[PDB]
Design a protein around this ligand. Structure first.
Ligand SMILES: Oc1cccc(-c2nc(N3CCOCC3)c3sccc3n2)c1
Ligand SMILES: [Cl-]
Ligand SMILES: [Cl-]
Length: 547
């Protein structure tokens, strides 16, 4: 009978094909029947488990009960794979608790790489269960009352043992609580996120000194942000020119008795909680010349250093927050494969749907380089000369430039980043090239029929042109980066599957086609050799057009 079945050669080949499918591939009924039929054989293969859970007819109490028996005996699946089980497709509680049990084995560092997506996955959990575990959401943490695991319980549990996790959990959830589209369209989901914040507060107050200190520092952050938002509103309300608005900004910031933003108790920076701040430096704060006049603010740190940020008001940072979170992931995966491409995954954090922070990286827009110095090479010559270096430039700086160009050319191609011009391409004096301002992703562009590979002429000239050694190395780094990221297609696709219901504009336009737009870029229909030539074709087609 079914438990004694062992598959012949032909059937093994078919099973390996099914098991190798991406996580998004809908299995046909024939595939489902075959995986069910050889379920006891497949218990030995951790990778077959997600396929098995998609072949069960859960409506039949017979199979359901047997499937859970097999789930418990199955060779434990990898952390990366468990993320599939938290998507909207799975409602069975025992399956969803299994996924969490797998996440429990992850280190905190990996857990932090996936956290933004895990907070979105709370939408697919049981709302009643979250509520039964127990209102202006921003006042929960600031209004303490005196004196197996589901996903909510897990994340709160890990947040209590890790202040960096706690910080991102707090701010990610507060933005979901504050989201007015969710309030207006999905009231239940809004309620659930309130209840999560109430559970989180509750657990923090139940805990030992360690945890209760954490809670009072989140409150200190929340009220600091509230006070800074109040100050930005005051600055904009006041008509008058940019010089006048700067003067008002610096005066309000210099009045600590009123606004209390220039001397605080070494609280964690929400943008980067590892940086502890004394306050904002009044006399150096100024507004950018742009429609929404965000501010550049220098925070004084515990060691007496300065950490510059951009604070934006009246703008939704969540699409940019998602892209920089994924770039950060992609950079970590490449580094784990011993490939450091000198990328610049600057921090972005939404403190609401209407405001947030970004890390200010010292750099010059390529347009300004062209305007002041004429070319990327002249810029490197001026600020990093070297008599015997390539084209009179320091070898380290050129090495960094070639790698960062390649890294970004492959990453912006995978993420489908549009609206690329010389004011959103930035450069440092150490040779790092990077992208900012991701308001167009996943194939969207303000123009029609945009080129798939976003490489321009001044980038190529920076490498010394198409006949240089630098250009040959650029190509190699591009195709090598592409093959590496393809090996992590499952993780990356699984994470995007958890974003399909987020209110991110370029996802919300076509939620159901979102994952495929990423998946197509990997060209998983091609072998590694073929994918290398496809990438070379992408570079050749772009460079030919440019000249
Ligand atoms: O991800 C977005 C979305 C919208 C705007 C911006 C952004 N970032 C900047 N950065 C951030 C990195 O440090 C270097 C300067 C700068 S500078 C002058 C404008 C500007 N704009 C980034
Ligand atoms: Cl299910
Ligand atoms: Cl400025």
């Amino acid at each position: 009978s079914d438990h004694d079945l062992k598959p012949n050669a032909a059937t093994r080949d078919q099973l390996n094909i099914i098991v190798s499918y991406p996580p998004t591939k809908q299995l046909t009924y024939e595939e489902q029947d075959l995986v069910w039929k050889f379920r006891y054989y497949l218990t030995n293969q951790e990778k077959a488990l997600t396929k098995f859970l998609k072949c069960v007819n859960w409506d039949l109490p017979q199979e359901a009960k047997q499937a859970l028996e097999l789930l418990g005996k199955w060779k434990p699946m990898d952390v990366e794979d468990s993320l599939e089980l938290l998507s909207s497709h799975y409602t069975n509680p025992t399956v969803r608790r299994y996924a969490v049990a797998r996440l429990r084995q992850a280190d905190d560092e990996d857990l932090l790489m996936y956290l933004l997506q895990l907070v979105q996955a709370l939408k697919y959990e049981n709302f009643d269960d979250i509520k039964n575990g127990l209102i202006d959401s921003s006042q929960i943490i600031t209004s303490p009352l005196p004196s197996e695991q589901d996903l909510c319980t897990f994340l709160i549990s890990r947040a209590c043992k890790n202040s960096t996790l706690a910080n991102y959990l707090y701010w990610y959830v507060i933005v979901e609580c504050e989201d007015q589209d969710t309030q207006q369209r999905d009231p239940k989901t809004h309620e659930m996120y309130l209840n999560v914040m109430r559970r989180f507060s509750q657990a923090l107050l139940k805990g030992d000194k360690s945890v209760r200190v954490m809670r009072s520092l989140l409150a200190a952050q929340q009220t600091f942000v509230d006070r800074l938002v109040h100050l930005m509103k005051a600055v904009q309300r006041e008509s008058g020119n940019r010089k006048k608005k700067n003067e008002r900004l610096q005066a309000l910031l210099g009045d600590n008795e009123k606004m209390n933003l220039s001397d605080v108790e070494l609280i964690p920076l929400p943008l980067e909680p590892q940086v502890k701040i004394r306050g904002i430096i009044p006399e150096t704060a100024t507004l950018f010349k742009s429609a929404l006049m965000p501010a550049q603010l220098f925070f004084k740190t515990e060691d007496g250093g300065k950490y510059p940020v951009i604070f934006k008001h009246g703008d939704d940072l969540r699409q940019d927050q998602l892209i920089l979170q994924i770039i950060s992931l992609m950079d970590k995966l490449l580094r784990k494969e011993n490939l450091d491409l000198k990328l610049t995954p600057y921090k972005v954090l939404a403190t609401s749907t209407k405001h947030g922070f970004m890390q200010f990286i010292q750099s010059v827009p390529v347009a300004e380089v062209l305007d002041t110095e004429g070319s990327i090479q002249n810029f490197f010559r001026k600020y990093a000369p070297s008599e015997n270096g390539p084209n009179g430039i320091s070898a380290e700086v050129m090495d960094t430039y070639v790698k960062s160009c390649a890294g970004y050319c492959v990453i912006t191609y995978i993420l489908g980043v549009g609206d690329r011009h010389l004011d959103n391409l930035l450069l440092t004096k150490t040779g790092k090239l990077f992208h900012i301002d991701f308001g167009y992703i996943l194939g969207r562009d303000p123009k029609p029929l945009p080129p798939p590979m976003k490489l321009n002429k001044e980038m190529v000239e920076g490498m010394g042109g198409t006949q240089s050694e630098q250009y040959q190395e650029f190509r190699k780094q591009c195709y090598t980066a592409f093959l590496h990221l393809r090996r992590y297609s499952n993780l990356i696709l699984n994470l995007f599957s958890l974003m399909v219901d987020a209110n991110i504009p370029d996802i919300a336009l076509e939620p159901d086609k979102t994952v495929k737009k990423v998946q197509d870029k990997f060209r998983l229909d091609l072998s590694d050799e073929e994918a290398v030539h496809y990438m070379q074709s992408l570079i050749d087609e772009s460079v030919h057009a440019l000249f």
